[PDB]
Amino acid sequence: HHPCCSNPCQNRGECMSTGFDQYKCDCTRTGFYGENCTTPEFLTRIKLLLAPTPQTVHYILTHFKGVWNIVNNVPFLRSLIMKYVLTSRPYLIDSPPTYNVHYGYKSWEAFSNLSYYTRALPPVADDCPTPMGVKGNKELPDSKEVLEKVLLRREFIPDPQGSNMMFAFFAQHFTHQFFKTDHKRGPGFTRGLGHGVDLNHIYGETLDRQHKLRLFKDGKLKYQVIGGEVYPPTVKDTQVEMIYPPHIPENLQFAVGQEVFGLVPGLMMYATIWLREHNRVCDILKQEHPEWGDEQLFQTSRLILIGETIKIVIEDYVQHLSGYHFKLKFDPELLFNQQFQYQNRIASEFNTLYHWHPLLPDTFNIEDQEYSFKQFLYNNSILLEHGLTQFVESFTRQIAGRVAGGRNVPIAVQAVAKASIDQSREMKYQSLNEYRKRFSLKPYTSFEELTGEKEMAAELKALYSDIDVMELYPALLVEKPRPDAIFGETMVELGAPFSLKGLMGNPICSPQYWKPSTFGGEVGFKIINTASIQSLICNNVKGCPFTSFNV
Amino acid sequence: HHPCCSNPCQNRGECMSTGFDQYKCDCTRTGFYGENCTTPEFLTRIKLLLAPTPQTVHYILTHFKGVWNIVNNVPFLRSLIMKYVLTSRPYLIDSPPTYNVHYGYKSWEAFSNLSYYTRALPPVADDCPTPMGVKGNKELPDSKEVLEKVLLRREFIPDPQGSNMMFAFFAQHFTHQFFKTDHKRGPGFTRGLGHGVDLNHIYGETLDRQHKLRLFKDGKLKYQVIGGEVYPPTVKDTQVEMIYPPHIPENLQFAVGQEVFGLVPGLMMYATIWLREHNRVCDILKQEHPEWGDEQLFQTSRLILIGETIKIVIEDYVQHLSGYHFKLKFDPELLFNQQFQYQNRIASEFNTLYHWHPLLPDTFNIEDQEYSFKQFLYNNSILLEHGLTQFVESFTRQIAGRVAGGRNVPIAVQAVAKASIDQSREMKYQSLNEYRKRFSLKPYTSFEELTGEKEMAAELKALYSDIDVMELYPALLVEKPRPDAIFGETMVELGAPFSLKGLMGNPICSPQYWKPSTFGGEVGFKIINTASIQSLICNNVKGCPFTSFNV
């Protein structure tokens, strides 16, 4: 079999076969050397003696409230710290990207073909004796058994951080602009050729689709008016392809950028909100530029909304997730004097870890009603019946589920959870511990260490036998969460670098774009720099209801 | 009309309309301020007093041979000097890219749509009172009249730098991998979506075309053997679409990566050489890795050949063009500690300036024959009759024409030269002096300063009236060349930043790629770092004839 099946090279050394039975490790710029890149240089010995654990840094940021409250009000000191946050792991993510599902070695095909998700770790070779390489049994445990024993929700477990349905649906809506799996090709392929925050889920992936969604007046998007309320246009009006079950009336077939957002009313809520925001900014821009035509109005509005999204994701969304007392800051200027690549390629593992199914509740509580999954799915009548105001007020109140900790995946999306496991194996993912080592984390030595618990650990032990063959996705869901937190260590240490790269890597954060002129002047620029989840709702939802990502 | 038509904003200031008759300049990070970004900051005033002129820096590099002899011999000093050259133009090139032919303002459509050539300067607005903005006459002079008076060749003017036909064909062959104009869409569109050195002119732009050219054995490309010599395969055998007149016999319809390379036997010479090189590398890699399969052998050979190209282009091709005594060096490690973006977008103006038609001779002298343009075009039988060895020996001896200095464009390519003028006007190029300021050059004050001569200057004066509305492309060809050089100032100061950006911006120059393991190990790595135009011919041409870019 392939000589690199056992993953011999440590510390991000690259493995290469030098024969049918022999491998070689490339230790270039790893800070290590030797046969397996395990012998540290003297400079490396120093760095390792002084590096604080991710648990220690998380403790500092989640304590000393009074101290951070002082820091958060000193602009110079806040910028300085946010600068460190953005640069404290400069080479975790490969940029330009390297491997994908079909290429465990670098190639021009892997680099140039945007239809692939990139890969943080190369796939396990096809001719390996065991699924994870050389360790474990001939076959991984039945994903059905893994699902039923440690993943499926018995009693509902609420998020201790108090995440609400506004947060859960925002997560779904935001991430599904760059998580668009091409199931015609396979789980390792994407339809999001932009590989980042381009707002294609609002404006459409292609120019053809964009032009069918546009009004071509005042730079605005097409819309309809139902009971005095502005909603997205219909499929019949725009000829925009949407995914709907056949029993859906044509007047309820709303057409938006993402073809699947008709699936859940929670997604149509944000789709409506963002559509209103686009047309709202067009009104502002037209007032600043009476001389501007439709095209420039539309494009500038798009850039501003891209800016608003990144602004919100960092200062409201990630801020809520982090649980830090330190106020994160969106400020591209912090990276101008730094080594940073303004480009991004979406990783397959970034998609996999973002399968936050436990976040979903048992029922969707709107106003006085408690809708089941069956009642809720593809039912935009619920949105028209209650309205955006009631949706926001209700979803702000309803708490979401805890992602880590185990046994909190709702029975409704059972097949989806099993698919995440199965497709991970299909894409030949390496084990949990390989991904932890890849992200400078210590490998788990036992299942009890992984779960911080005894019952599920024993279950996992009987299933996997070895901790070194434990899979990444199920581990993320059963991992011992941080104190009163929604996630475990692995989720954060993998998720965060992928996120900030995907946000700061946007071209509008590059120095030639980050100017008032790019956004139509100081007015358009300030729209971005003052944006929040609250203002987004206040400006576009009648009554201006209060909202947040916490209950 | 548009308020920015006069191009009021100086020093990379960005212009924006604020009313129907008012503009505003954005002087962000320009080092200037004021209404037109013309008032310099104090720190900026210092840098201006110290900055040496492009003429001065060129004088230093083309003189003091003894001082450069010492530098080239000591690797520490050579790397030090080359490091300065690679970082002398910090933000000359917008990366990520900005404008294109349809967008004179930053937009997501301009950034994400790879089918566009990007633009260093935005196009003149449609409703401007004159072709160049506000200056000049209602209409630019007739392009035929411009062509015939100052561009068309009277007597053949040989390049005083001694460039040969090996150079001229290498330039054409190499640059036509990223200069692939999509004439269906327009002159501002490209078919080279890789936007750089991907060797698509060898392997094909699309995976479909690539798979038709591949042998799928040992990683090699398909080929045929005629008279014991290795040539590319035919159109009939591969089903690869090529451009050939109907009368071309089946066996002379060679199939290569680029559809147009059958046009001239000089291009097929290099196409044949690179085809042999790929298969040669396959043989090397197969010996190193008996265990490797066809796919990995192909992909790794492609990465190696990409590296060879960049290596050769820098240390032989650009080295020749420069006329420097300093030996330019290809070493990606010199940028590892710098703020460099590993990405590229091909500029339309980079394409325009590379229309080096005057390079072409009156006849193509091979062995004892002197072929006319009519006889040379689409005639691969010439290549077979004389063979590769005679081609190299002959083209090494035949001198090419001078590009600058005026009146040296062969009448055979008359329509091509005029098309360069016409299409520049279609794409609404700004004037020569606007492009000189864009690249930190002093605007020409007269046509005599431009040509360093009186006769052509007088003809240009009558045709254009104002030096500030002189066009970019005709200026490059009539510009006063550097002393005993092939180019003028404007050609070098624009061409060099575009070239090095496209060469070093390649992903294989990034730290994660620039490793031995990427290229199959130290053996494959060495092939790149020892590559030369001489070694390319020596390894793949029978008899190993001497070759060079100078006669």
Ligand code: COH
């Ligand atoms: C992050 C939060 C989140 C939420 C709130 C959420 C809420 C819901 C939801 C609510 C009613 C339903 C019915 C589903 C059901 C699905 N989800 Co999500 N999912 C989420 C994260 C994801 C992600 C990320 C993907 C990958 C999308 C892709 O690759 O196209 C996903 C994919 C899916 C798929 C694709 C099937 C497959 O084989 O991959 C289904 C079905 N699911 N999910």
Ligand code: COH
């Ligand atoms: C760099 C040196 C170089 C050389 C030696 C060269 C030599 C020759 C040559 C020799 C026998 C012939 C027949 C041509 C003929 C052509 N060249 Co060039 N060309 C060169 C650089 C270019 C460039 C650059 C373009 C534009 C690329 C594009 O967009 O396709 C070009 C475009 C063309 C076109 C496109 C048609 C149009 O509408 O512009 C033709 C025809 N040509 N050229």
Ligand SMILES: *[C@@H]1O[C@H](CO)[C@@H](O[C@@H]2O[C@H](CO)[C@@H](O[C@H]3O[C@H](CO)[C@@H](O)[C@H](O)[C@@H]3O)[C@H](O)[C@H]2NC(C)=O)[C@H](O)[C@H]1NC(C)=O
């Ligand atoms: C990159 O930009 C290209 C130029 O803008 C663009 O090509 C253009 O595509 C549009 C839509 O696909 C075509 O316009 C279409 O509009 C009518 C609607 O009334 C259709 O019915 C027509 O069939 C027509 O195709 C433009 O004709 C076309 N322009 C050119 C010069 O090709 C590309 O699609 C853009 N690329 C991406 C990936 O978006």
Ligand SMILES: *[C@@H]1O[C@H](CO)[C@@H](O[C@@H]2O[C@H](CO)[C@@H](O)[C@H](O)[C@H]2NC(C)=O)[C@H](O)[C@H]1NC(C)=O
């Ligand atoms: C990116 O890679 C995919 C998968 O290799 C390519 O899709 C294949 O395209 C060929 C056409 O040459 C088809 O015959 C195959 O059926 C396709 N495979 C799949 C799984 O869809 C795709 O063409 C590549 N993209 C580019 C731009 O080359």
Ligand SMILES: CCCCCCCCO[C@@H]1O[C@H](CO)[C@@H](O)[C@H](O)[C@H]1O
């Ligand atoms: C509290 C709801 C039951 C949780 C018990 C976890 C074990 C569930 O067990 C499984 O549940 C699936 C869906 O109910 C069924 O399709 C399977 O037949 C069943 O084996």
Ligand SMILES: *[C@@H]1O[C@H](CO)[C@@H](O)[C@H](O)[C@H]1NC(C)=O
């Ligand atoms: C490297 O790892 C292999 C296991 O893959 C092991 O057999 C070998 O002893 C290791 N070498 C060193 C020097 O530790």
Ligand SMILES: *[C@@H]1O[C@H](CO)[C@@H](O)[C@H](O)[C@H]1NC(C)=O
């Ligand atoms: C859709 O929601 C409405 C409430 O607005 C409800 O009356 C109806 O039964 C739902 N449809 C399904 C199929 O559950």
Ligand SMILES: *[C@@H]1O[C@H](CO)[C@@H](O)[C@H](O)[C@H]1NC(C)=O
């Ligand atoms: C700016 O340029 C305009 C020409 O467009 C000129 O009239 C004006 O005086 C300039 N202003 C300054 C402050 O230089």
Ligand SMILES: *[C@@H]1O[C@H](CO)[C@@H](O)[C@H](O)[C@H]1NC(C)=O
């Ligand atoms: C092609 O080249 C051959 C020499 O090999 C010459 O005899 C022939 O006339 C050429 N064809 C044309 C059409 O000029």
